[PDB]
Ligand binder design. Structure first.
Ligand code: NA
Ligand code: NA
Ligand code: NA
Ligand code: NA
Ligand code: NA
Ligand code: NA
Lengths: 383, 383
């Protein structure tokens, strides 16, 4: 089974992603990884070393380990040293001071209590969204597989930021990605773009921060990934887990999501009609999933992100050392990370889709998986 | 690790739930199970046999197997026979006729293609929401554990059905459950109740069907279930998987969810203040989770359900046998199943919470787990 794991602290030496269970023969390079890491850095308001699992630009079949360096490591090499440091030397280092005032909205408080820590540092170092870089590295392998095996593309666009009027037009196609990635807020629609940029400008002036909604779209999927046989096998379950597990995400929808719940059955679903090469539909309210399976239509997954950067001077907290009232201090200064969150959602979607495809189509090498896919597609067409 | 699995077809002999990894010593009976199954039958518009794992009303520590009979089995005992039946005898049975016209919105089409079936019967039998009965049986064990180990209660109430004005007042407490369960639409609020009942009456008159939004609330949780250490360990990920995997669910939110994404950082989070016995908060926008962990506040999980019963004569489909146009025929006749969906969401929430509690607190018997919980609570209080 395809599996992924990330490791690293925000201010540690490096991050590591390991992907286990990918077939041999998938073409992927350090340059591909770096490119996706560059996309994760997009938005208005990462030295890669492949350590294992890839040879001469082709996966080997074994575990793929990717390291992502921390460029600021020299500043942190004592405070975040793996090995013991003389506590007296450490006592003279201002950077190593105690963080005992948890930020509302973050892991700090619950993580400190959970693990019995008197300092937020060990919590925030691992909880931080810097970890999504390691996710994106892993996701690159999944992306390559999906394209080479299935001709599938995963992209995203931003629906809303702050109080912007949500973009409710049709989703983009793959060929629209260059224009989206060139948008300061990775919007597909120019009117929504302007509205969102205005929201960011206003927040920036007010010294405030914003969240937003993003949509990942996966195109070209075969019918029948996921299953109806149990709750855990439904692809929507799997996608929900992968997307909700992203830092700052507080909601996930498939297709028209919560709006579908307000609609009558007569207008809620996607009717089917005859076509040359199979059943066709004129709507995709379902967002490409029915009964837990891909149905041939674009997969559409939406994620709601809370504002992720803490606001200066606004939020009351408690100094856990004393029990006294305090005010929370920020660790990040960006007004909005929604555009980049879209890229992270793409990654998580790709990983789940790749896993589901390997579950159905099997194989130990790409050529084998491809034969299996072709035979399945033939069997469907011959219906 | 606590694990659950369901088995059964809608018109098979019986359903089975198996729960593995529950501690010995939890008090739970067949009558408790039947009571929760009765709750699953609530809403305006199940013979239980415990086979293993419980002795004299106390769990044994091994796998708990619960069987739920199908009262209509005699009608289906040939059509759904496990063993071969003479195809000629079968050919004279109208009930065994082919279902080759997939219902929009259901598993039928994708499941037929996935598994190479020329009949929807094997798909709809397993995909059907009758399977949620087996979930509720399993969930009863989880509920008992949560109450006995942690004093935790899980309940639900309905937010909206069809185009009703959503209830956005405060959530109920445990002591409100009798009033909610006595409501025809399991609403906490009388004004919202009337609005929802009107929606159902209008749909019923029009020969249409409805979906809706429900909120599960879990009260009394300790701080620090779930973790920030990876995407899969975040409790919101786990809850999202469990809830989105329920039939007909198309969206999941934690706390204020998608609305949080429209708010500024200054008004999006729950500030902390000093209190006698620990940090206190005046808001719960987060819905009881921060950084993937319980934070002490009520857990609030919302689920969006599409309308789940097919509408007579409305939906075009295709006869897969011929390629000809057709109109979809329904398998269920209820206008709205939202109130009951709430009960199923409670179950899935309970199962995930019980699993997370056993992960942190360990133990093989309830008394052992309880000692571990008490010691943790003491250690927190002694901060
Ligand atoms: Na780590
Ligand atoms: Na190959
Ligand atoms: Na679409
Ligand atoms: Na079964
Ligand atoms: Na015990
Ligand atoms: Na609350």
């Amino acid at each position: 089974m395809l599996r992924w794991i990330t490791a690293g602290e925000s201010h540690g030496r490096a991050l590591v992603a390991v992907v286990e269970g990918m077939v041999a023969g998938v073409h992927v390079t350090s340059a591909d990884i770096a490119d996706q890491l560059a996309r994760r850095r997009l938005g208005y308001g990462d030295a890669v070393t492949v350590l294992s699992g890839i040879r001469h630009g082709s996966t080997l079949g074994g575990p793929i380990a990717i390291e992502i360096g921390n460029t600021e490591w020299p500043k942190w090499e004592t405070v975040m040293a793996a090995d013991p440091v003389d506590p007296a030397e450490l006592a003279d280092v201002a950077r190593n001071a105690p963080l005992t005032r948890p930020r509302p909205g973050h892991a700090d408080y619950a993580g400190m209590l959970k693990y019995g820590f008197d300092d937020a540092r060990p919590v925030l170092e691992r909880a931080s969204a810097r970890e999504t870089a390691a996710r994106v590295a892993a996701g690159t392998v999944a992306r390559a597989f999906l394209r080479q095996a299935l001709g599938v593309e995963v992209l995203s666009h931003v629906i809303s930021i702050g109080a912007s009027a949500p973009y409710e037009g049709p989703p983009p196609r793959a060929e629209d990605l260059p224009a989206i990635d060139a948008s300061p807020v990775r919007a597909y629609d120019k009117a929504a773009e302007a509205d969102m940029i205005a929201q960011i400008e206003a927040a920036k002036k007010d010294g405030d921060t914003l969240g937003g909604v993003v949509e990942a779209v996966a195109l070209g999927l075969p019918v029948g990934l996921g299953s109806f046989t149990s709750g855990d096998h439904r692809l929507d379950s799997q996608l929900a887990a992968a997307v909700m597990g992203i830092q700052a995400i507080k909601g996930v929808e498939i297709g028209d999501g919560f709006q579908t719940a307000r609609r009558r059955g007569s207008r809620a679903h996607d009717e089917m009609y005859p076509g040359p090469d199979g059943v066709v539909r004129s709507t995709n309210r379902a967002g490409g999933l029915e009964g837990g399976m891909t149905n041939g239509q674009p997969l559409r997954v939406r994620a709601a992100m809370k504002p992720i950067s803490t606001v200066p001077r606004a939020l009351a907290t408690v100094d856990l050392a004393t029990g006294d009232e305090a005010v929370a201090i920020h660790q990040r200064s960006d007004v909005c990370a929604v555009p980049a969150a879209g890229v992270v959602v793409e990654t998580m979607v790709a990983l789940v889709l790749a896993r589901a495809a390997l579950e159905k189509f099997g194989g130990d090498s790409l050529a084998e998986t491809q034969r299996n896919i072709a035979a399945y597609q033939r069997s469907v067409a011959d219906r």
